Design a protein around this ligand. Sequence first.
Ligand SMILES: *[C@@H]1O[C@H](CO)[C@@H](O[C@@H]2O[C@H](CO)[C@@H](O)[C@H](O)[C@H]2NC(C)=O)[C@H](O)[C@H]1NC(C)=O
Length: 305
Amino acid sequence: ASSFEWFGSNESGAEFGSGNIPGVEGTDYTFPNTTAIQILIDAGMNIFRVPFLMERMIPTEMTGSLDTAYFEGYSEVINYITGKGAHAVVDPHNFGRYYGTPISSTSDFQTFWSTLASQFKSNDLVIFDTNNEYHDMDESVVVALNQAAIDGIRDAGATTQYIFVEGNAYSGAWTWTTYNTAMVNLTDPSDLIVYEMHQYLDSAGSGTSDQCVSSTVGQERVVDATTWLQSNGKLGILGEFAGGANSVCEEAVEGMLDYLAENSDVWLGASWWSAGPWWQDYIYSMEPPNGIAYESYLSILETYF
Ligand SMILES: *[C@@H]1O[C@H](CO)[C@@H](O[C@@H]2O[C@H](CO)[C@@H](O)[C@H](O)[C@H]2NC(C)=O)[C@H](O)[C@H]1NC(C)=O
């Protein structure tokens, strides 16, 4: 069958042009292309993470109502993914901020998630991702925000879906034990928490260059996090990762994923960053037919499918 339970791609677009809230569809932002998603489904991928902006989903206050247009464009892509039998990760790509302000209301954040999860409650293939890449916030608040998210999700009766929780410091795997050990104190009625981390292999780990530090940096940056999951009896998914289209980066990726496949009892899978229809020139574009990463990594990544 497989090495991992899941392996797939992020599908970007709905989170673009975040300077313009609400912005205009087709100008500031778009929704992912279902035809292009099917090409990746055809290839063997079975999980897709679809970013969006909290402010476009629920404008003005996070206790408010849905924007019907933006939600229905987003819903359309989520339900295509689950319609084909693959898991769809619902990802408010917000860095723990709302209208630019670090989120500090656990009740307004729990109300946000109740409203959102209530529209997916009976879709067993939806995955909930509490927020993309918390950073530069207090660890206590971050953990409470992940707990508030779990609480609103279940309250609304979405109890069969996995919840992806993310840590501080951009939820990096290589820094996980430095900053996010507190995240062990998270609880779920359904007991379906997966710890989602991100790892890039360039100098800063910021994922902004196509050069990797070395052919072994990828394995190096996931060891500690692998031990932490095994130690505390938790589960993980690498929700984002990428490398440049050169052999040093490719070898780093392979040895990173080798090490995670060797530890698949804690690692449930991985998700490449990123596919989507507006990436063009992007160094990590997984979008068919021409994206650089589609051209250089798809063959590589299928060996782990
Ligand atoms: C959505 O994806 C499909 C397939 O990747 C794109 O369709 C291709 O479009 C090119 C350029 O317009 C055509 O020449 C190909 O014949 C199409 N291929 C297939 C398999 O249909 C489609 O354009 C994408 N939508 C976008 C980018 O907005």
